[PDB]
């Protein structure tokens, strides 16, 4: 079965880094003349084909982007734990998803990325509270150390399956 996953979030929060880690298993830069956005995985004893839309962070109006996002069945909403604006942007991203899907019931996971960092401005309890208020899972991740990365995408698949 096919799963279309869309990664959204403010500029620089780690959308591309998370996707690259999920698919290619590395953080440091590599040079080899094409990137893959598809992965075959087993989740809860059943095989999945995952396609990932790693959205550009810079936002604008676009009917085409709306259609690309509308194609997604589930969404990772990503902020960085050292970026309070990216956290406060999450409400906007959820509203955006609900607009494009024309629904209040869209599979979603809240992701707090960069938990490897030496300092933090967004505390865990804030994010757990917000996710709970949305009725969605919350997962802290690090694209650098790979901590939680599999868990974030796999939990999103679990949410889609329950839809």
């Amino acid at each position: 079965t096919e799963y279309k996953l869309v990664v959204v979030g403010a500029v620089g929060v780690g959308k591309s880094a998370l996707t690259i880690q999920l698919i290619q298993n590395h953080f440091v830069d590599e040079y080899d003349p094409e990137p893959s956005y598809r992965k075959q995985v087993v989740i809860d004893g059943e095989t999945c084909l995952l396609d990932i839309l790693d959205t550009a962070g810079q936002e604008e109006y676009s009917a085409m982007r709306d259609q690309y996002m509308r194609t997604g069945e589930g969404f990772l909403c990503v902020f960085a734990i050292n970026n309070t604006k990216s956290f406060e942007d999450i409400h906007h991203y959820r509203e955006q998803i609900k607009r494009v899907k024309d629904s209040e019931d869209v599979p979603m996971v809240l992701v707090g990325n960069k938990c490897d960092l030496p300092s933090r401005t967004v505390d865990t309890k804030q994010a757990q509270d917000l996710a709970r208020s949305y009725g969605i899972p919350f997962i802290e991740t690090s694209a650098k150390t790979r901590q939680g990365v599999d868990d974030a995408f796999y939990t999103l698949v679990r949410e889609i399956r329950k839809h």
């Binding site: 094409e34 893959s36 396609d51 839309l53 550009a56 982007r65 690309y68």
Partner: peptide, 30 residues
């Protein structure tokens, strides 16, 4: 940045791979 065409003899899985690439590319250049 635009993905290369999949190839005339591309398998269904090859097309799936290309499609995911194009999905990302189109979003990026809007």
């Amino acid at each position: 940045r635009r993905p290369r065409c999949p190839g005339d003899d591309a398998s269904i899985e090859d097309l799936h791979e290309y499609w995911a690439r194009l999905w990302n590319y189109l979003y990026a250049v809007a």
